[PDB]
From TrEMBL, chains A, B:
Protein name: Putative polyketide synthase
Record's subcellular location: Cytoplasm
Residues of the full protein shown: 1593 to 2199 of 3950
Function: Involved in some intermediate steps for the synthesis of the antibiotic polyketide bacillaene which is involved in secondary metabolism.
Organism in which the protein naturally occurs: Brevibacillus brevis (strain 47 / JCM 6285 / NBRC 100599)
The organism's taxonomic lineage, starting at the top: Bacteria, Bacillati, Bacillota, Bacilli, Bacillales
Ketosynthase family 3 (KS3) domain ranges (all copies): 1-436
Length: 607, 607
């Protein structure tokens, strides 16, 4: 029982999980031609399978802004950033976004150690194609040295966030993210780490990838993308970066963090010797799925949705279906009781982030309570008939009904269990089982009233960043339909889940409508207005000692907080004082919620 | 308690662990100038730290024959081999050599599964610099596509050997091998794998490595190699490949496999935020060593030898010594009771195989019962004084005396415990604790006599390979001073630890001297002679069904074996028959011993 308390990711035509969900439910094939920002793309295309390495050329899912970073926010020189892997940059940003989404600060995440916290980091990456530019430059002349060591992608994260736990970069073909989650979960069970950060990353920036994908017949001709049925003969590579935060279920419940799902079981293996290399083994797939389900203590009859490795390959889909059918028929002989689909039909093939993307899709589906359509499964493979299999491919958006079944003379309404599979080209295979979280009790004791008004504080490094942050908060309060009953939750998340920074903005509000009105008024260029607090921290330094080496001022702060006079405390917190927000809540701690993260800058940095 | 039952490795100026031990005990600095087979090496040298990337140029440990392979033995086309990573080739060869050394066949290693065996594979590799040639070719014109994915290094091994367990390639800077051993040991404890193969690999084949190592001030000026003391300011990179076979101690004892050592405990972590990147944290080092020793249940007072990360860096050695001193002073305040050294002063800096090389050095020292001299530690660092520390650097070959101490009023003669540390540049740190294996009882019941003569069988794929194998066996029987009391052990190892192949040679022998005489006579070109059996397997195929679909012949074989008439059974095993050698030994199973492995061919294959 390992809970998920935070997730983030950038995927093609989607900067956030919310945009990803919008594209998923709208059924959008977010796969287009290669941008001109990357290689010219006209040197290698020939429309025939002869020796150029292309002819599977203008089809790939790409994330906008791969060369965008805010190195200053991380205390990194521009000269260092220009030569640090974009995978590393993007993973660092995604980990920070995930930590912010979880409602935890780097200085209080797993911090129950006294020196910085025992947090593990696991990242799935296959290859680095950034130093290949250095090699090309060396061959042409000049001199340049980019080195790889994909361990940096996690070591830099652990160094910046000051984590004291294991930091390793696993590597299994097309299953690195699932293997990383496997290892992180086992570390959590053993107690090596109190909290973990698992994830994966992949970006396509050098044509060598496509050249190899064509030299080997792993490409997908002129088809738009993966097709789970009807004569699919390849897969379309895609970019993608993602991360998820893992904590034991009991600790998450006690701390009150919002939980997306629970990873009940996990498994990995290798197929072995087959009739050639890069040929999957249905027996091994069945065994790994079997062991995952046993470790999870789950009856397959209770499963409702399973995400498959997909790839639309001619000789991967029937084998995967056979393995699933064999490992499901052992216990139940019923048919057409489960749904099957893949996010690859939407976003392409990450090859390292495929597993994390599928996990994100499953979590979004389980949060919005709606099964999402698949793509290109209109006709289905003629080779295999789904009538005998227990799987029916989902084609349209539908309510994910809570399963109700009858086993062994007993009728029960089981929860929403789901499965995800990821099989590597080399032979490595991985599987995860997931289940939804059911809250025990849910009631806020009317904590908002004239006796205790809501305090809203936002901190950033500049004026533009603060403006973007407030814009995003307003847009979120609109698009996620937030109410005045989750005002204390927003206040707590913003108080003890966002680092204090140079520029600070604070207001006292009563209703959500008043909050929105004051935020819009601030967006309008007005200087002097009531209940508006704005300030810096570095312009003022003479009174730092005055309020740092004095305890009677702390007693005055306690008295003012008891009285409810938040105006002065905010007027001087916006300036410079450390403030324990936790003691503001004597008891009945409010839970955390998802809010927009820091709007990093978009500075360009390339060789 | 995880036992070691087999090891292999190729290191500079050493094709085998025996040559490695010879060079270690002789105190040989096996670090020389870059061979002309690799890059020209005269393009980048300038003797000054200005912009060419060299000026730390002609100093590195290299393994002879990095482009040598026997693809036919592995059923791989020459065209495939020319474009498969030399790291992958060398690791495959080393894994086969390790399995052969352990006295286990691929078809009987962890084979208690019914379909091929649940064996795990873990490999430590930092970077692949082989596709950089493809990039250079692309830039210059033409077209070529080598792709990396260092997971292949393990996936190919698992596919060839038909293993059904996890196969992953970890990546931590300069600690990948130790992290792999960590993960393999925990998998063994959890039961995911019954047997494991851990290892590491590194080869230097592209100048970009040295260019980066100079651009960053991680190089070692004009000094020959690492210097643990007296003004060392860098490290010298080196090539190296190695592997070790891991099994639980009880299973190894029951199966009778020879055991090198026992891994009592292991630990890994990350330093965190320090005063800059690539700066070690003594507190983190102390904590990881602490946790390793607790997991091992070992009192540091009982430790006798500890291998350090070394690297001779100006700002790594005092910090490592401080960490070790802090984590050792907690329990004991005594000084100069332990020895410290590094194999890096001999073989350079593997950066992925450093840990496996140190483990090999420790195992060889613990087998030959002799502490080996360090190198370049004549004067020692003036900054740190070893008088207060519990460590004295070993400078000459000496007997590794069994420690005898007095703790808490109780005097005891403890075993030979040892430690090994490996710290990464990024911040990842790892530590292992090792202890020797003490046999309970040791006596052969005079199993060799006229009533049961020794049977010696050797199989290879050709005549030249068989000739080399017999030459190596004779040279080994001479150089390891084997007697006539370990004739049954050799017979069993050769019978149930070597795959039957096309060319087979069999003899019946009584004394070791007679064995050597017959082998030498065979080396001499004679055709017809007594007690000599030679044959093929594929020239004869008509009687295969005759002896495969007949059981009365099996009864005749049993009767002949009972009678002791081995001549006919060998005369026809040399031809084609499967034979269960195990039933030849009714009881009192003989143990396995280390013998030379298959002499792979030296075919050259490069871009």
């Amino acid at each position: 029982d390992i809970a998920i308390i935070g997730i983030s990711g950038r995927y093609p035509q989607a900067r956030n999980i919310h945009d990803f969900w919008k594209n998923l439910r709208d059924g959008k094939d977010c796969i287009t031609e290669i941008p001109k920002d990357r290689w010219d793309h006209s040197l290698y295309f020939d429309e025939a399978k002869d020796k150029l390495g292309k002819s599977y050329s203008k089809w790939g899912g790409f994330i906008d802004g791969v060369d965008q970073f805010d190195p200053l926010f991380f205390h990194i020189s521009p000269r260092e950033a220009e030569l640090m892997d974009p995978q590393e940059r993007l993973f660092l940003q995604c980990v920070y976004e995930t930590i912010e989404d979880a409602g935890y600060t780097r200085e209080t995440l797993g911090k129950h150690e006294g020196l910085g916290g025992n947090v593990g980091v696991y990242v799935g990456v296959m290859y680095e194609e950034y130093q290949l530019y250095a090699s090309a430059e060396q061959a042409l002349g000049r001199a340049l040295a980019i080195a790889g060591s994909p361990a940096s992608i996690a070591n830099r994260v652990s160094y910046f966030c000051n984590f004291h736990g294991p930091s390793m970069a696993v590597d299994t073909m097309c299953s690195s993210s699932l293997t990383g989650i496997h290892l992180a979960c086992h570390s959590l069970q053993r107690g090596e780490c109190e909290v973990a950060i698992a994830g994966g990353v992949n970006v396509s920036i050098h044509p060598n990838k496509y050249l190899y994908l064509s030299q080997g017949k792993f490409a997908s001709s002129k088809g738009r993308c993966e097709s789970f049925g009807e004569g699919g003969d390849g897969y379309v590579p895609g970019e993608g970066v993602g991360a998820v935060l893992l904590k034991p279920l009991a600790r998450a419940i006690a701390d009150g963090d919002h939980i997306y799902g629970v990873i009940k079981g996990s498994a990995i293996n290798h197929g072995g010797k087959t009739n050639g290399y890069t040929v999957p083994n249905p027996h091994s797939q069945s065994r790994v799925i079997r062991r995952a389900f046993e470790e999870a203590g789950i009856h397959p009859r209770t499963v409702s949705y399973i995400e498959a490795h997909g790839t639309g390959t001619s000789l991967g889909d029937p084998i995967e279906i056979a393995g699933l059918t064999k490992t499901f028929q052992e216990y139940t002989k019923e048919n057409q009781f489960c749904a099957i689909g893949s996010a690859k039909s939407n976003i392409g093939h990450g090859e390292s982030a495929a597993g994390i993307a599928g996990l994100t899709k499953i979590l979004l589906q389980m949060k919005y309570k709606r099964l999402v359509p698949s793509l290109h499964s209109r006709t289905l493979n003629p080779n295999i008939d789904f009538s005998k299999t227990p799987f029916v491919v989902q084609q349209e958006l539908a309510e994910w009904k809570r399963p109700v079944i009858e086993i062994d003379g007993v009728t029960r309404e089981y929860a929403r269990i789901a499965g995800i599979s990821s099989f590597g080209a080399g032979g490595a295979n991985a599987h995860l089982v997931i289940e939804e979280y059911i809250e025990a009790e849910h009631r806020p004791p009317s904590s908002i009233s004239s006796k205790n008004p809501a305090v809203i504080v936002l901190s950033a490094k500049n004026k533009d960043r603060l403006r973007e942050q407030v814009q995003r908060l307003l847009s979120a309060i609109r698009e996620q339909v937030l109410t005045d009953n989750d005002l204390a939750e927003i206040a707590y998340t913003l108080q003890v889940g966002r680092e204090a920074m140079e520029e600070r903005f604070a207001v006292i509000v009563k209703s959500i409508s008043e909050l929105e009105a004051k935020l819009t008024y601030y967006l309008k260029d007005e200087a002097d207005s009531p209940d508006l607090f704005t300030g810096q921290v570095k312009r003022n330094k003479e009174t730092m000692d005055v309020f740092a080496a004095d305890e009677d001022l702390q007693q005055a702060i306690d008295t003012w907080i008891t009285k409810g006079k938040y105006a002065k405390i905010l007027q001087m917190w916006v300036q410079g004082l450390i403030f324990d927000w936790n003691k503001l809540y004597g008891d009945t701690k409010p839970r955390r919620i998802s809010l927009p993260a820091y709007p990093f800058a978009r500075e360009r940095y390339w060789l």
